[PDB]
Design a protein around this ligand. Structure first.
Ligand SMILES: N#CCC1(n2cc(C(N)=O)c(NC(=O)C3CC3)n2)CCN(Cc2ccc(-c3ccccc3)c(O)c2)CC1
Length: 286
């Protein structure tokens, strides 16, 4: 009996957790005894639609996640073959975007810097395996407990070729542009330093407790104007070229803001690293 083999006839769909253009993540109960005692699991799968291989990309995502082992990376549990489904552990607290607005009273700056460290450890582990994540945002950081977070989605994750510094992207219409570094917006090139820029944005979200009126989209649309349609991304590039950045969050000390700003150097080569950030946060926690 293979414990990573989930039979479709026992995987009971409960509700949607997430939806993109091509696929979804759903809450299921795996219930082989038929009495609702089985474990809740998160299930990634494709919409019937498909195309230019969404299936090949999901199969690659499965092999990426199956072979990652880090306490700050969501746990692979198995697959279901029917078309294929990725089975992951279910974290009932959800993403930082769900959890932080409801728990501001109990999550103080120390706890925020601890989450920051754990996000940097999972990212540094992914970088060491020659992966770029390309979608690091608070909506993809899951809460295991009050004391532990995990990166919880790998839908855009790509291998950087051995002896290369970046991955060039082709399918980009659904890019999360308010988290993206200039090189990503201007040339669809994705470096590890591009994930460092996305981390700085995610840190700003963590420091604003993911409030919707302080989101990176809301704040950048206030700076550049919300009415620009197809011109939005070139206006965003121009704002960043001029050196404008997301402002210091309320109650964020300058010493934390300065680590964030090192994430947002225009040139990738000038940005801090994940291991520098961990050292910086650890000095502040000492
Ligand atoms: N991380 C994280 C956030 C998500 N999440 C996982 C769990 C869990 N494991 O528990 C969870 N938990 C809760 O919300 C509990 C409070 C109730 N939320 C929810 C949002 N989706 C967005 C999304 C959807 C589809 C694709 C996708 C599909 C097919 C092919 C390619 C791409 C994709 O890459 C990403 C990502 C996972």
């Amino acid at each position: 009996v293979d414990p990573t083999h989930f039979e479709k006839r026992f995987l009971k769909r409960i509700r949607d957790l997430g939806e993109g253009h091509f696929g979804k993540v759903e809450l299921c109960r795996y219930d082989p005894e038929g009495d609702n005692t089985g474990e809740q699991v998160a299930v990634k799968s494709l919409k019937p639609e498909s195309g230019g291989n969404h299936i090949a990309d999901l199969k690659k995502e499965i092999e990426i996640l199956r072979n990652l082992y880090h306490e700050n990376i969501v746990k692979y549990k198995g697959i279901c073959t029917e078309g294929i489904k990725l089975i992951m552990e279910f974290l009932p607290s959800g993403s930082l975007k769900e959890y932080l607005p409801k728990n501001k009273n109990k999550i103080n700056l120390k706890q925020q810097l601890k989450y920051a460290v754990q996000i940097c450890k999972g990212m540094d582990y992914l970088g060491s395996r020659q992966y770029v994540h390309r979608d690091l945002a608070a909506r993809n950081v899951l809460v295991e407990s009050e004391h532990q977070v995990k990166i919880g989605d790998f839908g855009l994750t790509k291998a950087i070729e051995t002896d290369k510094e970046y991955y060039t992207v082709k399918d980009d219409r659904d890019s999360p542009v308010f988290w993206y570094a200039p090189e990503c917006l201007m040339q669809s090139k994705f470096y590890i330093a591009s994930d460092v820029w996305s981390f700085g944005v995610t840190l700003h979200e963590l420091l604003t407790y993911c409030d919707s009126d302080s989101s990176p989209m809301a704040l950048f649309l206030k700076m550049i104007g919300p009415t620009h349609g197809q011109m939005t991304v070139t206006r965003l590039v121009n704002t960043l070229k001029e050196g404008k950045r997301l402002p210091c969050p309320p109650n964020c000390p300058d010493e934390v803001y300065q680590l964030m700003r090192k994430c947002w150097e225009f040139q990738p080569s000038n940005r801090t690293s994940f291991q520098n950030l961990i050292e910086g946060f650890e000095a502040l926690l000492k």
